């Protein structure tokens, strides 16, 4: 019933084992081919996991058995990883010895190696098995001798080199040689005689100076086992004393038995704190992982398991294909293989102990140990021989790019999902779409059944599947039903790149009849989808929960503006621009009479009757009025707009027409437009206010109209608006008849004496280049400037004659409005696309003087053809790069969600108004797209007022703020503007409301609860696609620029030396001097006698953002790299706020490595705010003034985002075996705080509804709630 909070993870007893299993498997028979029920206590037993019959199947899910080992194993992980966790915690090497031990026959033996074979005293040493057994048991030499043969030699005779034992016979070194009957004992071994009782006995090992028999008489004199011989009444003492012998895992368990974890913490900080860091560094490697196991219960004895758990069979099931074939998780096989090995071992021992065979058993075992566990690491198991498919392990199933981390984050499949090819829709409302019936009805199958069984269409559901399973017996009715079941439901539409939020989007389906889906226009750029046929899919939401989510704020009606910026996104697109634009302007043709009309008032009378005649136009160019003017005036605008349905005025004529309370000088359409602005909303007050019914509408005009409308209206009003907008610029667009034929690419002729010019600019540069004045790369630059500004020339040319000639042509009408284009474009078209550029990069000398217009010569298509390829590789590889920077993105910054109470922060940013460096020395307001993505939408810090105007402590920064400030600034008040934001929030794991800010998909603050993190990282990644990028990547992940710049540390006065070697650069101060040298190639942008302070740079270039933090401060570095990517973002014309960036660099920098030590190691490095935590507790919460000095560490995203105080996170990410391994030695109890975490749960999520501030939220209606509270009074009594 409780949420779930913490998940700990740690190791396992053997009694945990033992009380987590549900009995014990010990046959290798899973399954026989002919009893297809499990077959005896096998891997799939049907007693041991549960009955496979109809509790559930999910005990055999759930319930798991075990393998109780005769031999005790160690678990993989931690001898294989590469901290060895018992070659770390023991004093054993891990590429060898440790596996040579586990694996092979070597010895480890404490106690006791004071035997000497040339070699000192034992007490860690490893040492082989030969040897070991060979010091075992003294010194073995036998030579045998024939029998009835009473040789030479008795019982305790001496023998040294070169002495004949026979007459061919020699030993080998100096000893004993004891006489058998039947052979000669060669020992270097100590003879005792004696006459008295023994005190040792035969078997014991004795050590000098104690009795050996005799009393006082005789006592021993070396270490060795004592053997006493009644034949001759005498005392052998060998070399062998009784030492310890231990092999394999029970060895290591030992050690781990005898290992204390307390008196090692003891004497590794001994070990720590005497030496230098040499030392110390592993030292500590080796201290947290002792910490972990003393701090976190779990004592390492365990580490090593006894008995093995075994998976639930429905986790690795073998099912059936076909034709009896089974097809098997590697799972299954490894367990049979390591039941059959066990069982072999079991039978081994029961029966008898070959040494050797016994060895190679165990060897065998625990090799089947390490494949079962993870297979890969010691060799390759594989399948039956003939198929070389490397088996698949628990870590496969875990790890891998395909695994239980890594498939439940993506989910690849759904069920209730469509495609199809996407058309525009334009007879729908922008909170519809388009849906063919067929898949509508395959849809909501379900859905239809239920309502068609609710209506007597059907008896019950198995006849609706079989009527409903052939389409020759479909019917009205059923159509009928069909549009009652998704009369209020809503589907979700994606794009296959989903770049950004706005990928998916709700909409209300219709039905259609057709193929293809089909979609509002508008949202043509929402998704990044053309109409060229590139298909879109469907996913529809079953419970109501979810659909109140996708109806609410998913739905497109409700998402008109960026989250990147306050631009809309639903803003009227290419058409109706167009159309609105036709609509809206005015022309203007010629004035070959007397203009002056202010003077004559006859010249009213005059001017009427010159335009009987052809003496002034009707849309004159009369010094104050036209004669359009003065002839027709409409007392309203429907008089107007019916005059002009009879054609005698048309839509772009001026004329005076009297509104509500002015008489203005205006074409019927502007006045229409007017109307159809105060037609889509109620008022029109408010919409006679919120336009300019004195320019045409431009794109620009367009977007402007739609920002105020959400301002100002809201959210439905809006909509209507854009709706209405679209439909009415479609039908003018459709009737104004706008075309492209080959004669709307004017050709201006000015433009030719121009190339002229330029061409005879050429020869001189040429002589100039012949009479040897110029270098290559000076010509070469003097080529490219006249080019580039005779290019220039030609486009000023070409607008101003299309200006004075043509105000109505085609291609200019769509330079002008926003519909489609560029000036460079149109310059290709009728100009001339001069400049092309060579695979090199450069550009080539010779220009493109023909443009499409005109012909291409075969050699300059063939030129162009390389810039074309150019482009097409670019775009292939960026949008790919692109999708990676997202994905770190998200991945670094998925922790951020807004749960807070205001969070007390004293602290702020000033964003400077004023640029401080757009010339070297000059201070000039910022551009006001940048003071806008910098400000809008942004909380005060403190009250500021500054032209008459309270701006209190704690207002968000609306538009209308930001104007007033950029016009203030203007005249000269204020620079700089204190703000909150996430770079100084204090809470926890996010940021404040206030901090964060008041921009959204609506205008309104933020509210309580949503992923910031996600979003901006989307916001980030998103324009990346059209996006240089190089830069923004060795941005995010913090690295060292190849062209650095160098920069001061200290505040001081600039010595320029100009050293012809090296320009040095003095940083003088009262006490010392700074030098830095300069290169040939390091360009300066300092003057001598110049005063600096930290972080100036020097030189012109890239800074490193480490060094920077290190001389400065994080606030300094944290603006810098703000500044530094907004500037490439800009650079591209995307607009892009700073909440984002500003909310990754936080993320980026939240992490601190103390310095002086506290209750913990120094030289470690993590999340600040435990820090925060921590210090609060020592210095005032509880007592111990112990200063935990920390130091800010910056590092890149990648960095940032591998080291997290969750494991989940960090398993899923990189790599599942060393974070589960560190996460398993000390019990690490994962909080449910992040994303990412509870989508591997699947839970609910922590960010948006599934926030605890609005998680749980009793509702209740009136009348029940009248009746509870009748209950309540009535239940306090009396
Ligand atoms: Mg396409
Ligand atoms: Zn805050």
Redesign the pocket.
């Known amino acids: 019933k409780k949420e779930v909070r913490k998940v700990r993870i740690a190791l396992a007893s053997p009694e945990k084992i033992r009380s987590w299993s549900y009995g014990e498997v010990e046959k290798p028979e899973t399954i026989n081919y002919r009893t297809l029920k499990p077959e005896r206590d096998g891997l799939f037993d049907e007693r041991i996991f549960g009955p496979i019959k109809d509790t559930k199947s999910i005990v055999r899910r759930y319930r798991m058995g075990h393998i109780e080992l005769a031999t005790p194993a160690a678990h993989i992980w931690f001898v294989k990883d590469v901290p060895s966790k018992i070659g770390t915690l023991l004093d054993l090497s891990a590429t060898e010895l440790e596996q040579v031990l586990y694996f092979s026959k070597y010895i480890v033996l404490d106690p006791k190696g004071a035997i000497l074979n040339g070699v000192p005293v034992e007490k860690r040493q490893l040492l082989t098995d030969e040897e070991y057994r060979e010091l075992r048991y003294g010194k073995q030499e036998t030579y045998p001798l024939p029998p009835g043969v009473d040789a030479l030699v008795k019982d305790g005779e001496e023998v040294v080199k070169g002495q004949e034992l026979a007459p061919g016979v020699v030993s080998r070194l100096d000893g004993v040689a004891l006489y058998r009957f039947a052979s000669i004992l060669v020992v270097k071994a100590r003879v005792y005689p004696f006459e008295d009782d023994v005190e040792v006995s035969t078997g014991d090992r004795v050590a000098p100076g104690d009795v050996l028999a005799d009393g006082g008489k005789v006592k021993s004199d070396v270490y060795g086992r004592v053997e006493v011989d009644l034949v001759r009444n005498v005392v052998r003492v060998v070399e062998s004393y009784d030492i310890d012998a231990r092999m394999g895992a029970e060895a290591i368990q030992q050690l781990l038995k005898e290992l204390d974890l307390e008196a090692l913490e003891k004497e590794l900080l001994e070990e720590m704190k005497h030496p230098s860091r040499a030392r110390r560094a592993k030292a500590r490697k080796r201290l947290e992982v002792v910490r972990a196991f003393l701090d976190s219960g779990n004592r390492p004895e365990w580490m090593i398991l006894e008995a093995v758990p075994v998976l639930p069979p429905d986790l690795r099931p073998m099912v059936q294909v076909d034709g009896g074939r089974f097809a098997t998780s590697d799972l299954n096989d490894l367990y049979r293989r390591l039941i059959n090995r066990n069982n072999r071992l079991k039978k081994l021992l029961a029966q008898g102990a070959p040494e050797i065979i016994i060895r190679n058993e165990k060897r065998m075992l625990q090799e089947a140990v390490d494949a079962l566990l993870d297979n890969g690491r010691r060799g390759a198991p594989v399948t039956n021989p003939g198929s070389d498919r490397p088996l698949r392990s628990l870590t496969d199933i875990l790890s891998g790019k395909q695994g239980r981390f890594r498939q439940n984050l993506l989910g690849k499949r759904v069920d209730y999902s469509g495609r199809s090819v996407i058309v525009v829709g334009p007879q729908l409302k922008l909170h519809q779409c388009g849906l063919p019936k067929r898949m509508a009805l395959e849809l909501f199958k379900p859905f239809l059944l239920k309502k068609m069984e609710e209506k007597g269409i059907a008896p019950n559901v198995k006849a609706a599947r079989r009527m409903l399973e052939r389409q020759r017996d479909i019917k009205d009715e059923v159509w009928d039903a069909l549009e009652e079941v998704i009369h209020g439901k809503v589907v979700l539409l994606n794009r296959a790149p989903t770049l950004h939020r706005l990928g998916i989007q709700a909409f209300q389906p219709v039905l259609v009849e057709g193929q293809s889906i089909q979609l509002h226009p508008l949202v043509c750029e929402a998704f990044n989808?053309?109409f060229?046929?590139?298909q879109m899919a469907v996913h529809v939401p079953l419970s109501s929960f979810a659909q109140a989510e996708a109806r609410i704020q998913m739905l497109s009606a409700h998402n008109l503006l960026s989250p990147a910026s306050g631009e809309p996104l639903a803003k009227p697109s290419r058409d109706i621009i167009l159309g609105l634009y036709y609509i809206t302007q005015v022309r203007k043709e010629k004035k070959g009479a007397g203009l002056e009309f202010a003077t004559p008032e006859e010249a009213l009378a005059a001017h009427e009757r010159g335009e009987v005649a052809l003496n002034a136009p009707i849309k004159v160019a009369g010094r104050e009025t036209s004669v359009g003017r003065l002839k027709y005036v409409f007392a309203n605008p429907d008089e107007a707009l019916l005059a002009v349905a009879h054609g005698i005025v048309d839509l772009q004529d001026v004329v005076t027409v009297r509104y509500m309370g002015k008489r203005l000088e205006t074409s019927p359409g502007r006045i229409l437009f007017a109307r159809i602005v105060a037609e889509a909303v109620e008022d029109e007050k408010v919409a006679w206010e919120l336009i300019q019914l004195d320019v045409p509408q431009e794109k620009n005009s367009l977007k402007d109209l739609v920002y105020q409308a959400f301002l100002r209206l809201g959210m439905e009003k809006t909509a209507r608006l854009l709706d209405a907008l679209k439909y009415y610029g479609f039908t003018f667009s459709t009737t104004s008849g706008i075309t492209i034929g080959i004669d709307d690419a004017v050709i201006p002729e000015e433009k030719k004496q121009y190339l002229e010019e330029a061409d005879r600019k050429l020869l001189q540069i040429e002589q100039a280049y012949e009479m040897g004045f110029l270098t290559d790369r000076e010509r070469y630059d003097q080529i490219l400037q006249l080019w580039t500004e005779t290019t220039e020339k030609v486009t000023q040319a070409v607008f101003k004659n299309f200006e004075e000639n043509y105000p109505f042509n085609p291609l200019y009408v769509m330079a002008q409005s926003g519909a489609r284009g560029n000036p460079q474009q149109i310059r290709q078209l009728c100009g001339l696309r001069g400049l092309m550029q060579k695979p090199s990069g450069e550009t080539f000398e010779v220009p493109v003087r023909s443009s499409f217009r005109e012909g291409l010569t075969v050699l300059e298509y063939f030129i162009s053809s390389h810039g074309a390829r150019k482009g097409g590789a670019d775009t292939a590889l960026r949008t790919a790069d692109s999708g990676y920077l997202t994905r770190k993105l998200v991945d670094v910054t998925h922790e951020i969600v807004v749960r807070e109470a205001d969070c007390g922060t004293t602290n702020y940013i000033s964003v400077p108004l004023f640029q401080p460096d757009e010339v070297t020395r000059s201070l000039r307001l910022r551009k006001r797209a940048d003071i806008e993505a910098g400000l809008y939408g942004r909380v005060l810090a403190r009250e500021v007022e500054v032209l008459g105007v309270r701006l209190e402590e704690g207002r968000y920064l609306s538009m209308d703020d930001v104007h007033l400030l950029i016009k203030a600034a203007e005249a000269g008040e204020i620079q700089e503007v204190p703000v909150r934001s996430p770079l100084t929030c204090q809470t926890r794991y996010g940021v404040c409301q206030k901090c964060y800010g008041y921009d959204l998909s609506m205008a309104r603050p933020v509210s309580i609860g949503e992923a910031v993190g996600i979003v901006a990282a989307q916001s980030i990644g998103e324009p990346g696609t059209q996006l240089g990028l190089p830069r923004v990547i060795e941005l995010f992940e913090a690295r060292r620029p190849k062209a650095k710049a160098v920069i001061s540390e200290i505040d001081g006065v600039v010595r320029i030396e100009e050293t012809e070697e090296k320009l040095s650069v003095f940083v003088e101060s009262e006490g010392f001097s700074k030098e830095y040298k300069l290169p040939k190639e390091a360009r300066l942008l300092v003057k001598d006698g110049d005063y600096v302070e930290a972080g100036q740079p020097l030189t012109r270039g890239a800074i490193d953002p480490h060094q920077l933090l290190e001389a400065k401060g994080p606030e300094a570095v944290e603006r810098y790299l703000v500044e530094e990517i907004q500037k490439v973002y800009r650079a591209q014309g995307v607009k892009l706020h700073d909440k984002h960036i500003e909310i990754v660099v936080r993320q980026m920098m939240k992490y601190v490595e103390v310095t002086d030590p506290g209750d913990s190691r120094l030289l470690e490095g993590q999340v600040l705010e435990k820090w925060d935590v921590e210090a609060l507790n020592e210095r005032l919460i509880a007592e111990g003034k112990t200063p935990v000095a920390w130091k800010p560490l910056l590092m890149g995203v990648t960095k940032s985002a591998l080291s997290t105080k969750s494991w989940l996170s960090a398993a899923s990410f990189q790599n599942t075996t060393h974070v589960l391994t560190e996460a398993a030695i000390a019990g690490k109890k994962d909080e449910l705080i992040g994303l990412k975490e509870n989508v591997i749960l699947g839970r609910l999520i922590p960010a948006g509804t599934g926030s605890d501030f609005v998680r749980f939220t009793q509702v209740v209606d009136q009348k029940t709630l009248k009746a509870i509270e009748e209950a309540r009074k009535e239940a306090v009594e009396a």
Do not use: K, M, V
Request: hydrophobic residues 20%; charged residues 60%; glycine residues 20%.
């Open positions: 989808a053309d060229d046929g590139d």
